[PDB]
Amino acid sequence: NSEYVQFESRSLLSLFTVGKIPPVDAAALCYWGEYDPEMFDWSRDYMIENIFENLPFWTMIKQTNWGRIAIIALPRFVSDLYSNQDDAVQVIIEALEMAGIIGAKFVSLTGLIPSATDYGLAITKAVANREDLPKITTGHRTTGAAVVLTIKKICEQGGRDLSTEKVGFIGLGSVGMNVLPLMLKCLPHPQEITLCDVYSKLEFLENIEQNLVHKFGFKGKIKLALSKTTVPQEIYDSTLIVGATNVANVLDIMQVKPGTLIVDDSGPHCFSVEQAIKRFQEREDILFSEGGMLRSPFPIKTTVHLLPSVEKIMEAVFNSNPFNIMGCAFSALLSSQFEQLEPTVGICDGEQSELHYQILQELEFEAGDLHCEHYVLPAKSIANFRQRFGKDLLEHHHHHH
Amino acid sequence: NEVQETLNKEVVQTKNSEYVQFESRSLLSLFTVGKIPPVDAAALCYWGEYDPEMFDWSRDYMIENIFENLPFWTMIKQTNWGRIAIIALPRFVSDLYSNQDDAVQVIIEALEMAGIIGAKFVSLTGLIPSATDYGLAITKAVANREDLPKITTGHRTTGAAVVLTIKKICEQGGRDLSTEKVGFIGLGSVGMNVLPLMLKCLPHPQEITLCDVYSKLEFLENIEQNLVHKFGFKGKIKLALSKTTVPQEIYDSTLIVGATNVANVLDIMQVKPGTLIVDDSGPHCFSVEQAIKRFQEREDILFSEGGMLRSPFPIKTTVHLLPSVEKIMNNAQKEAVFNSNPFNIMGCAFSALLSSQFEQLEPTVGICDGEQSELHYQILQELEFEAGDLHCEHYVLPAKSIANFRQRFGKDLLEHHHHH
Numbered sequence: 001n002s003e004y005v006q007f008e009s010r011s012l013l014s015l016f017t018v019g020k021i022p023p024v025d026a027a028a029l030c031y032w033g034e035y036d037p038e039m040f041d042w043s044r045d046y047m048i049e050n051i052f053e054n055l056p057f058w059t060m061i062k063q064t065n066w067g068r069i070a071i072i073a074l075p076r077f078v079s080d081l082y083s084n085q086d087d088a089v090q091v092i093i094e095a096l097e098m099a100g101i102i103g104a105k106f107v108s109l110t111g112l113i114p115s116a117t118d119y120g121l122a123i124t125k126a127v128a129n130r131e132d133l134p135k136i137t138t139g140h141r142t143t144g145a146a147v148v149l150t151i152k153k154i155c156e157q158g159g160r161d162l163s164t165e166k167v168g169f170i171g172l173g174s175v176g177m178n179v180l181p182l183m184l185k186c187l188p189h190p191q192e193i194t195l196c197d198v199y200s201k202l203e204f205l206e207n208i209e210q211n212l213v214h215k216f217g218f219k220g221k222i223k224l225a226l227s228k229t230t231v232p233q234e235i236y237d238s239t240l241i242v243g244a245t246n247v248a249n250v251l252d253i254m255q256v257k258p259g260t261l262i263v264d265d266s267g268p269h270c271f272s273v274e275q276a277i278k279r280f281q282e283r284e285d286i287l288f289s290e291g292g293m294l295r296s297p298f299p300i301k302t303t304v305h306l307l308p309s310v311e312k313i314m315e316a317v318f319n320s321n322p323f324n325i326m327g328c329a330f331s332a333l334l335s336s337q338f339e340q341l342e343p344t345v346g347i348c349d350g351e352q353s354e355l356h357y358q359i360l361q362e363l364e365f366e367a368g369d370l371h372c373e374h375y376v377l378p379a380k381s382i383a384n385f386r387q388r389f390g391k392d393l394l395e396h397h398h399h400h401h
Numbered sequence: 402n403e404v405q406e407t408l409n410k411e412v413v414q415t416k417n418s419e420y421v422q423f424e425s426r427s428l429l430s431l432f433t434v435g436k437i438p439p440v441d442a443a444a445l446c447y448w449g450e451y452d453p454e455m456f457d458w459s460r461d462y463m464i465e466n467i468f469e470n471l472p473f474w475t476m477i478k479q480t481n482w483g484r485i486a487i488i489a490l491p492r493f494v495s496d497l498y499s500n501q502d503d504a505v506q507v508i509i510e511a512l513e514m515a516g517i518i519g520a521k522f523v524s525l526t527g528l529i530p531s532a533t534d535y536g537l538a539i540t541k542a543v544a545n546r547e548d549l550p551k552i553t554t555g556h557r558t559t560g561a562a563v564v565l566t567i568k569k570i571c572e573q574g575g576r577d578l579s580t581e582k583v584g585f586i587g588l589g590s591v592g593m594n595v596l597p598l599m600l601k602c603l604p605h606p607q608e609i610t611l612c613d614v615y616s617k618l619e620f621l622e623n624i625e626q627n628l629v630h631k632f633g634f635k636g637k638i639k640l641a642l643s644k645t646t647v648p649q650e651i652y653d654s655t656l657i658v659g660a661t662n663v664a665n666v667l668d669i670m671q672v673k674p675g676t677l678i679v680d681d682s683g684p685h686c687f688s689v690e691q692a693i694k695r696f697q698e699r700e701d702i703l704f705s706e707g708g709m710l711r712s713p714f715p716i717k718t719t720v721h722l723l724p725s726v727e728k729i730m731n732n733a734q735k736e737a738v739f740n741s742n743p744f745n746i747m748g749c750a751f752s753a754l755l756s757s758q759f760e761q762l763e764p765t766v767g768i769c770d771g772e773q774s775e776l777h778y779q780i781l782q783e784l785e786f787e788a789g790d791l792h793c794e795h796y797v798l799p800a801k802s803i804a805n806f807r808q809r810f811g812k813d814l815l816e817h818h819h820h821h
Contacts (some may be wrong), residue, residue: 010469013429017517018471018510046403050410053426056434094434101433101517 004322008305012058012070016102023103025067026332027134029056029095030110035077040313048075051309056095058102062325063301066363067333070102074113081116088113089122096123096133104134106343108332111267114138115246119174120345137343139331141353143265144178145360146327147291148186149367150263151179151242157370158261158287159386160239162187165261168194168238170231171245172201172208175265175292178350179242180208184216186357192221196235199226239394243270244291258285258397259389265291269372277375284381285389285397293368294327294360321376324368334359413732420743424721428474428486432518439519441483442753443550445472445511446526451493456729464491467725472511474518478746479717482784483754486518490529497532504529505538512549520550522764524753527683530554531662535590536766553764555752559681560594560771561778562748563707565788566679567595567658568603573791573803574677574703575811576655581677582608584654586647587661588617588624591681591708594771595658596624600632601775608637610651613661615642655815658707659686673820674701675810681707685793693796700805703798708748709789710781715743738795745789755780 008015015021032052035044048054052075060071072095074081074088081088092113099107109120117123120136127133155162167183167190169176180193193212195205205224212218225232227250235241236255243251243264253271256262264270276288299322306314334341334356341356370377389397416423424431431437448468451460458467468491476487490497490507497504508529515523525536533539536552543549571578583599583606585592609628611621621640628634641650647667651657659667659680669687672678680686692704720739722730730736755762759780791798810818 010471013433014469014471014514017429017514019513020510042403046407050407053430055426055430094436097435098430098433 002318002322004299004301005318005320006301006303008303009308010305012061012303012305013098013102021061022068024061024070025103025336026106026108027070027072027099027102027104028108028110028326028329028332029072029074029092029113031074031081031113032077034079040310044077048077048080051307052076054091056091056098057307058098059305059307061303062329063303064296064325064330064333065298066337069329069333070099070104071329072099078112078116081113085117085122088116089126092117092123093126093133096127096136100132100134104332106332106335107134107136108139108329109136110139110326110328112246114140114174119347124345135335135343136345137331137335138174138345139328140174140178141341141344141350141356142294142327142331142334142360143175143292144182144350144353145357146294146367147175147179147242147244147263147265148182148357149294149360149365150289150291151183151240152187153367154261154263154287154289154370155240157382157386159390160261161391162190162240164391165190165240166192166194166238167240167242168196168235170196170227170235170241170243170251170270171247171266172197172205173244173246174347176242176244177208177347178353179244180212181216181350182353182357184218185354189218189220190240192223192238193218194223194225194235194238196225196227196231199228202226242291245270253279253286253288254401256286257394257399258283259394260286262286262288263291264288267292273372273375276372280377280381284384287370287377287382287385288372289370289377290368290372292327293371294325294330295321295323295366295368296325297323297364299323300325319374321368321371331356418739418743419717420715421718421720421739421741423739424719425724426721428477428719428721429514429518437477438484440477440486441519441757442522442524443486443488443511443515443518443520444524444526444747444750444753445488445490445508445529447490447492447494447497447529449494451495456726460493464493464496467723468492470507472507472514473723474514475721475723477719478750479719480712480746480751480754481714482758485750485754486515486520487750488515494528497529501533501538504532505542508533508539509542509549512543512552516548516550520753522753522756523550523552524555524750525552526555526747526749528662530556530590535768540766551756551764552766553752553756554590554766555749556590556594556768557762557765557771557774557777558710558752558755558781559708559748560591560598560774561781562710562788563591563595563658563660563679563681564598564602564778565710565781565786566705566707567599567656569788570677570679570703570705570791571656573807575807576677576815577604577812578606578656579604580812581606581656582610582654583656583658584610584612584651586612586643586651586657586659586667586686587682588613588621589660589662590768592658592660593624593768594774595660596628597632597772598774598778600628600634601772602778605634606636606656608639608654609634610639610641610654612641612643612647612651615644618642660707661686669695669702669704672702674699674818675815676702678702678704679707680704683708689794689796692793696798696802700802701810703791703803703806704793705791705798706789706793709792710746710748710751711742711744711787711789712746713744713785716746718743742789752777
């Protein structure tokens, strides 16, 4: 019941081969989340062998004003990619072969696929000098641009100036190392920056601190804090929290002070999504949103083909914003339309993300409106937040517990 | 549920042949991930006739929700000369006869799929030619297109297979063709191919009887005149006209070559003892079960398929059943059809591979230049090809029974029987 979301009962691969579906220009690989024994009544290995059949599954088509992109689901769960890298690389190459057939020239590795494939390098090992396959990309330079666009939006809608914010970064990984230099070059420098990571990355954080004062030109307070399973209480003194970590529920959403802004690319989210919604509905004292979601100026027509096996035991996709598309997936389409936006493999210099930011703003792209998975923060609640939690009013709220 | 579900599966994973092998996963999907090499040709087929007892679904439900109005790549034939894809159109026999425009449309879509998996030529097997004006209805719709593989009716190759079956049924029966009174039932597409080819490659018979429906009298009269001038036939030529059932005149024939599409026109119980029968008809012009019953009790006839070829080397066949249908066949002998002669392949399907390897063998659309079949016959012989062993659908004639026929109805023994 919408012209921008339509379900297709027949296989998209078959319809393509009979000339009923035009080729795509790019593709994006995803996985089936994590296995839940209450959702499905099969075992994990039975679903991999008999339901997914160890084959890539072309499940979605997104028609944008800048090309078409196919969504292909690998026949694995997220834990299966981490426990066997060789098998994960193998199923990706097969998915790359299918993506090349349907016309894709670039393929994004969405979710935790980079974190499990040496950020794409484990795949380039097996591709060697093969050319018949489309080129892979982690899309993390576009994800970083989407995070910076969300920082800009959550501060604008919150009625808060970034230059008088105390920003805390949880997780300085591939996406994290793209956001921090890009944030300083596109937005006003904050009053304070806090870097937080594992003990293994102390010298790593110590480096970024020194790069912050010389190379990036940050002249504010820089503090270093280390996480042990959970975040140090020091991070709760931050007024804006930027999360880009792979460990889940590291931030206690009930310990953040009233008026905190949270931008989290992490999927899974570094905080409890359900506890954040409940606090926001009762208190309306926080702003939190996805970090890696982009909002296109023009709507996107999404065709959906569910696996008939899983379709029986299933809203979710129809209950979506037709203007929204993930920055990681869209990155493959960007590389296919703009040769200057080269694909990214592994962790490398994050300065080039400024090109992605400029292009995204040139096309009148902005971050997706403030939302977290299924929940969209209502505009009237955001307005109530702006009137109640300006910088001059943060000290005048009771911090529970 | 799982536990037993998996057990069941484990067992039927009998996959027992190095020549025939079942694949539970989609052949199209396995191709797109580089696990299945491209093919050189394809063959289009259909799901036979719908009988409400075989399947438990409605005919419309199966077309819309089981076939999903899409072609189904169901088989791969790996021969020593190329690979062929067997693609099933989402239609039955009547769906092709009742709507030609829709039949052409789904055929176009099948050509599109065949081209993607690498096929350069596509055969129209079964009754598809008779339902698409022998390909002309498809050629008119693909006009001005260069992106699709070329279609062919393959009837020049089926005709070569029929002549090869005539040569084999006479050799195994211990009979000489030059002392046979041959009767042709149906001078259609393949019939107009076998008659000129038979005279140009095998010894001329003593007598020839042309038999068809009434409206084609002067057509039969004209080819009769072509028989005496074009091919130098100096034997007796009689013309009989059939209506509903063959005329008694061809029951006087000792070798019967059927090439008609109307079924049960020849009474197998009226055939004189010692008669040899080759039939391409699909539906067979005779009752198959009555022929098996008479052959098992009396062993006084030889009958076989006409359009089946036998390759000198075995053929590796990959079979992927429709998962919906696979559970309805369950574990009966409908899956014992897996057991088949790995040397056997239909001449119609094999024709598409022949055109992809030999440029002199042009695709055929419409009924034309039947003599040209001689090429098809010559190359096939140079490749050491022969007709399939004497068989009729599921039944293969045992060698001991064929020997009993040759011992009792050989070349010098036919004249010493009751009906001469």
